Design an enzyme around this catalytic site. Sequence first.
Site: not given
Ligand code: NI
Ligand code: NI
Lengths: 140, 140, 837, 837
Positions: D404, D406, D487, D489, D491, D516, D542, D590, D606, D630
């Site tokens: 995981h 990035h 992936k 996600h 987003d 995700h 996660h 965020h 969350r 992550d």
């Molecule tokens: Ni994530």
């Molecule tokens: Ni991630």
Amino acid sequence: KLADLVMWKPSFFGTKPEMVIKGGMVAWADIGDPNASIPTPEPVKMRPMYGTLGKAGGALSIAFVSKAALDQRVNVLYGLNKRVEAVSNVRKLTKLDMKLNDALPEITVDPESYTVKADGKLLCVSEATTVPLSRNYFLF
Amino acid sequence: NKYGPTTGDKIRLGDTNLLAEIEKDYALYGDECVFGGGKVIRDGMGQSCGHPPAISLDTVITNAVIIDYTGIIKADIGIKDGLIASIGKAGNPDIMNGVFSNMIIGANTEVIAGEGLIVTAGAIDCHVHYICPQLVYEAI
Amino acid sequence: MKLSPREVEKLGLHNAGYLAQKRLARGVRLNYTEAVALIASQIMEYARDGEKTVAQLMCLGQHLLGRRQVLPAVPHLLNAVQVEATFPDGTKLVTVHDPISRENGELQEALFGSLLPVPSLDKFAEDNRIPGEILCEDECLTLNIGRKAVILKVTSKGDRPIQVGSHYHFIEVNPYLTFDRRKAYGMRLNIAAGTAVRFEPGDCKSVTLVSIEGNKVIRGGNAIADGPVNETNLEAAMHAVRSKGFGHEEEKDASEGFTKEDPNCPFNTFIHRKEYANKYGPTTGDKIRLGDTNLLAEIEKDYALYGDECVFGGGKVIRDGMGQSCGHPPAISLDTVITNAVIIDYTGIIKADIGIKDGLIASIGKAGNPDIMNGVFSNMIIGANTEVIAGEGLIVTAGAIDCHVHYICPQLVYEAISSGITTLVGGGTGPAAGTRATTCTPSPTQMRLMLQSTDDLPLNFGFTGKGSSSKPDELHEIIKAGAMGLKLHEDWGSTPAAIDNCLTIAEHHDIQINIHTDTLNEAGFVEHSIAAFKGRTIHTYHSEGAGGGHAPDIIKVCGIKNVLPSSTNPTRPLTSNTIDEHLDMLMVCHHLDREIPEDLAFAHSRIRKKTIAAEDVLNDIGAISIISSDSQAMGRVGEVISRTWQTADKMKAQTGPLKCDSSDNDNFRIRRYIAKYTINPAIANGFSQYVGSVEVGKLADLVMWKPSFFGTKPEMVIKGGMVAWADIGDPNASIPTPEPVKMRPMYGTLGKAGGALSIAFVSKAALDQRVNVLYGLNKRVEAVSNVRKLTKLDMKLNDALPEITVDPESYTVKADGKLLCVSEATTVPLSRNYFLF
Amino acid sequence: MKLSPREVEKLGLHNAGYLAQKRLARGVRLNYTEAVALIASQIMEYARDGEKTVAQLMCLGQHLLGRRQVLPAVPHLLNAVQVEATFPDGTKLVTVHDPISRENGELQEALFGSLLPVPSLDKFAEDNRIPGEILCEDECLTLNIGRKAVILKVTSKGDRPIQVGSHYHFIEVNPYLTFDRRKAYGMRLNIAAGTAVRFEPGDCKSVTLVSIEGNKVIRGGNAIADGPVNETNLEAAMHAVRSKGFGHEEEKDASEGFTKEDPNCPFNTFIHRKEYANKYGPTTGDKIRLGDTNLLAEIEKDYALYGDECVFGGGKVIRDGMGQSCGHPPAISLDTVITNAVIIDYTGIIKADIGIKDGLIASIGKAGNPDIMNGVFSNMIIGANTEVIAGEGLIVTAGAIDCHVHYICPQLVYEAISSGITTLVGGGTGPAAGTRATTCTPSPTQMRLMLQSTDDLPLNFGFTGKGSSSKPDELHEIIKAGAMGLKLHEDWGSTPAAIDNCLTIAEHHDIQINIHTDTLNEAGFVEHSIAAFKGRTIHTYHSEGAGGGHAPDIIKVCGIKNVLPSSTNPTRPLTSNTIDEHLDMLMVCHHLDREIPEDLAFAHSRIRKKTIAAEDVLNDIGAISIISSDSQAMGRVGEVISRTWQTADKMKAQTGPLKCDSSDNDNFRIRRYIAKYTINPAIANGFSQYVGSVEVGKLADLVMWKPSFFGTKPEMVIKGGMVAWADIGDPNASIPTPEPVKMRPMYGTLGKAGGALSIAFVSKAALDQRVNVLYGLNKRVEAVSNVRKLTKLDMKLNDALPEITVDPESYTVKADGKLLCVSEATTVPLSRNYFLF
Ligand code: NI
Ligand code: NI
Ligand code: NI
Ligand code: NI
């Protein structure tokens, strides 16, 4: 030295060799009908072998260049696969360095008759009406 | 005479006494993939115009009689990335039934006409003496 | 010790923090950088002590430094400090929000663990900017105008929270939301782009919806209503709604209408300019202060359609079927999109999305998904294969182009790109005396070696040979070897014979000639060198003269039509320390002796306050077209950009707005100056079609800046469409922002990526020779061109041609008979507020 | 200053030392790292003063820090401190042995040269482990059992010392040793492997000899008795002995017999387990404490034959004709052999030699020379062309696999490998917003660029594209370009339509899908996303949810058969600061406002203490199969390994041994947890045949650990059979251990070595396309496979499938109706005892 060798049958020496070895690998050779059960049936011709395919040729040879060119790494610049070496030791040579051909006779040539002499001796030789290594071997 | 034989028909192999019978055919009579002027493999017709670019076959061998140890059949052959991507009924799922996602003929698909011909795997000679390169040419 | 990379890093951070503590201890009012270092280091120390929790430190961190212990701009620049440290329960992230919250900090705490004596409060001695501040008219903007609208009551029947984003197709929402699905068909929330509405279990809220636009094609979600918005698909959708159990209840009397430009219209959603700017960056009419300078840039136009802004994030706009297109061919998806960027370029100051494709700027305008948005052209489509760089709130400019680079060492290349420079033009072979003095890569073997040496570096490179020769023979060879230009330098001889020969060579090869004239007037005076040009195009380096040139009037070239004049940056702008600094710099570099009158006479004839002051004015009126570094040879490579802006700042402060400037902003001056280190450098050297400006078709060499740090420290440098360098913090951190944050090389600098993102500029003779192949270069190679028919008039926004005169005795400079007076500045912006040293 | 690299290095060391001094000054009890820094720095300072000799400092160094000024584990961890400095007579090496020798150190000396005030002794405030301690039964082991033996009197007739090693063919010894050469034929010293016997001139000692074994072929030495042991060669040997003048004297009544498993047998040589472990590492039955955790690993089996251990060094076993074979074909010599390694792998905890050939693990067992040793198979032969890595006393594990990742910056790659990670799987293109939020490498051009960018890095890489699309079109393209997975996600949109399409694509390409989920429950609740899976294999990132996912019950996926669940590391394990830290981390990332109830509601939905606590338990019982980072996106890349072990440690402390654990050790729990970052990650992503465990045939990606530092800071990282990174000190030092010792890149990171040692994992479509050729990659490329028929049951030792429920209001989590309660830990191991910050 490089294994650049030529195989000859005594009967065909000086005219048509059996195979030419380049850098230790057969480059060209007499071979017959490729579909034949053996390699000798007709037509037997001199043909390029595995040393002529792909980049094999370069791996078996050398491209001779000057030392200035090698210092420049022209082999790299030109992307050559063939090995490159510089020539050398050619500015201190004389006729005496020519193996078994180091004769230095005083040559004279008559301006009018063109008669040539070596150390005052005439160099006469009649013309040959025939020569070997010819009629017995070539198709044309 | 138009698409090559189908199930039940027999084919004489060369001028031998052997007869091969089509064991099965993946074709759906009437939707055969035939290329040519005014024929089936054209935009929106036999040539799909509604699938993602990436799944178009690179090449399609149409209406091939396949003779393989796994069987003697009639089918289209799909080729992708130099591999046999599929064997079955090729075409355009937008107007034809039985065309799977791996046998789609698209704008970027080449056509090899197999109708009337027999397709087999390339032969494998495992007792080769690399005596000369010419026999390689004879072999292929 | 078995130190891991992060431990080494944190030790450095601590060192910076300690430096800040010692400065604080003597009463120094810390700047932004020092404040961050101190606060972050203290959080680490308290964590080491193991007596404070994360929550406690989030609080203690706000009591360390007060307004009185930091510079006035600090409270504005410092929103938070982040850092991770090893607590008794492992590594933890601590964010100190608004650290400067009091008048005076608890200095014993600020000095905790330092063993330094705590200074009494009186030791900190007492109106300036809000660096990068945004100025907006007190006005509201109306979103999504001209659309069909409806207001529906939405009830949550779920036992868990449900939140819906602004661009989500409403009929596709969670089945546990009940409302009139038929009325929601083809609609979306009429709320600020990127925001959402939250539905707690059992909640019922009325929401305003607006119709989607563009091609009006629904895709994604639950696949309830996939397809073009029409009667047939609506019925298919409602059948799916009932069939799949999605909450639906007819609301016969739901108010319906259209959104419009009417403050009275009940369906409209408004947003104040202040909040809009805080969300998407400013729009048309707003002004932005560049760094801590006095310059204000005004957005001239915005391609956005209020309400459809491309914002990426959870529940935001750039998602499948929404802002991210799901109905276009794969091949046309942009590789990357820079959203909501304020673009500052000589061509204008605008607001727009930037599309990148194959390392090139593919488009500038409104990006998104034409299936639900209006105004999205086929070349600005965001797809599944599109990366997003968030530009909202930031300024984007072309990568800078330094065309007076001495390749003395590779380290200055790193300094250059970390400051915002993506193209280097100059000469050199390393720290050899020849290179330390001139921009020359003398031999074909060094030309090959330098091209191979920099082949993996993420910058475009141009190398110049030595043009100081009276014969063309050797010049042809260095040009064929790869030189994209030639340098005439007095150190190699800048005589009329060499000048003429060199220019004749230039006429044949179509390369630019750069010159450092005969300071000694040995072979002639400035008029004689100009005569040697014979009207041919030539680039005069450091035209003012401190960097070299006919003493004391070389600056006269700024009025010569065939001259493209540039200046180097140490004299930019004239300040209190400039003269003393330069006089000694010169003498030390030429090993001169103050006690020897001849040496002193020479020095004084070359370092002149009068010509440097004139240089300030000449740059301001556009008589000097380029600003460059002269890196480590009487120039600073990392200050080409900052020096340019400090000059513009000084000129505005002393002379006010330019004639062509509006008086509401400094847009014209800004455009004139940015052209000095972007487009002009590219035009002069012959590669303006590749770089030099933010325009479609050119390489995507772009730099991202925070307004507060504009002209000083950029956020990230994009090379050929990929991030080459960028600010990044602790690599082991849970996020990328905790300390220490430093400018670091990114993926564009590893392996051979650098070459794939750049271009090595050479002459057309070299390209005809295919030197790129011969040298085994991975970096793309292109030939320079169109540089022999250029005149001062081709220098964008810097085409002024005043008649310059210089008094032989007083050195007084005049432009068209007018004095060029400018007092020296005692301070400059883009300095004390930003640097550690 | 003209600073050389070592001077810069030593300045850093001094800085660390000063940090330690300031901490000491306020009464901080220093940890291992700080103690080393301080002591080494002080030695340098005293050397600078030029008043103390090397001998004096070897002593002063022991009086600096006392037990009361350092943490309890320090005296155990700190055997010595080494450093070189410039003394008046040049550079000299100083080794301070057992520095913590007193109760209180001479603090004025510890602070010498710092100018810091000396703290009073009362400032240091007052039962824990011996990190990495070895536990052995009070027992002796019998060496070389079952061999013919004889005791001979050996007299030295030389005037210089003669020392003979354990595996030297005795008849081949120095001619100046006199004894019965006939009886020594085919024999060797019956002493601990690697030890010797010394003969001072004139000495005579009785020695016990045992017959060599295996093929029994004598080679090397003086070539006195070369050949197979037999009557004919014995006679030839004795003739050579007499002929060449080698000392020989018949000892008619020398005792002869055999060695056996009998404490009474006079020919036997015994060694206590304690000394054996100190020499070769522990053996069967012994237990090792992993770092400073509470976990004890027990050696399940040992392939060694006591007495024939492969130990390298002067006079030791691995020498020509002895432990190093001289009678096998060149081609079968191992490239490298890791001797006496304690292997901890999910397949078991064993003791064995590890053979490496062509970058692969060629064999695991007993290595050596079959000519004199029994049990040496043809694939574990140590020859002339074999390198030796000493594993005695160390633990070897497979390189970790973080799936995981990035790719936000290249620096985290360095942090990763320096911590023990050799394989990275994730997505990104650099610090772009898209990458900072999701593991996605969007476009084919960025896929090519990232593969080229990391091509020289010594780690295996896997890049994932963006799977968030409702159409397959673009997914086919990114996969063909090189993506080995996709992936999904939120987003980018994690809706049912995208999930379904993405999985359909996965079924066709045989790549894994990572997801995700929809935290906002916008398109549906967790049950709806699971329905969208349609029983297809998918990897949930996660799974607990703090890192993202359906609020508040995403963790339910841990009970779904077709789900391969992993967790990210910031929540591992639940500690005192976890909640406060995460709540603020989330809101800052965020841009949420505490003062806005909606934002706060979201955050609280969350970040849940209850689900994080459950995650501790679920990981412990094997309901969560993988632990990942992550990296810089709510995760720490350098803590995948340490966090895994801190979780296991916490669970043992609060719940005791696992059901399947023996109560004498924690082997099962250890195997279950190590599988989380080794084998499971490889199986889930489809490349388990290449890496993921210490098994024959796989790549030799191995990590060496000192038990005392296990799970925190490894000694060296082996990539493809070559050292990629390792702890190394002062490069100018006489040896490699003096300060500063840091984790540094080795030869496996230079030139293109990195690519030769690794693999770039891609999809089979990409390999069919030959992207490795198209992209000019030097790193080996292989396609991922067999990932579409996987279920939770295929996750090694983590195949638990409990029915998970989550109370909608309380967030209470239950597994099969049982509460998953676990209090938060106030401290964790593998932290304070090791890190500088
Ligand atoms: Ni994530
Ligand atoms: Ni991630
Ligand atoms: Ni100059
Ligand atoms: Ni210069």
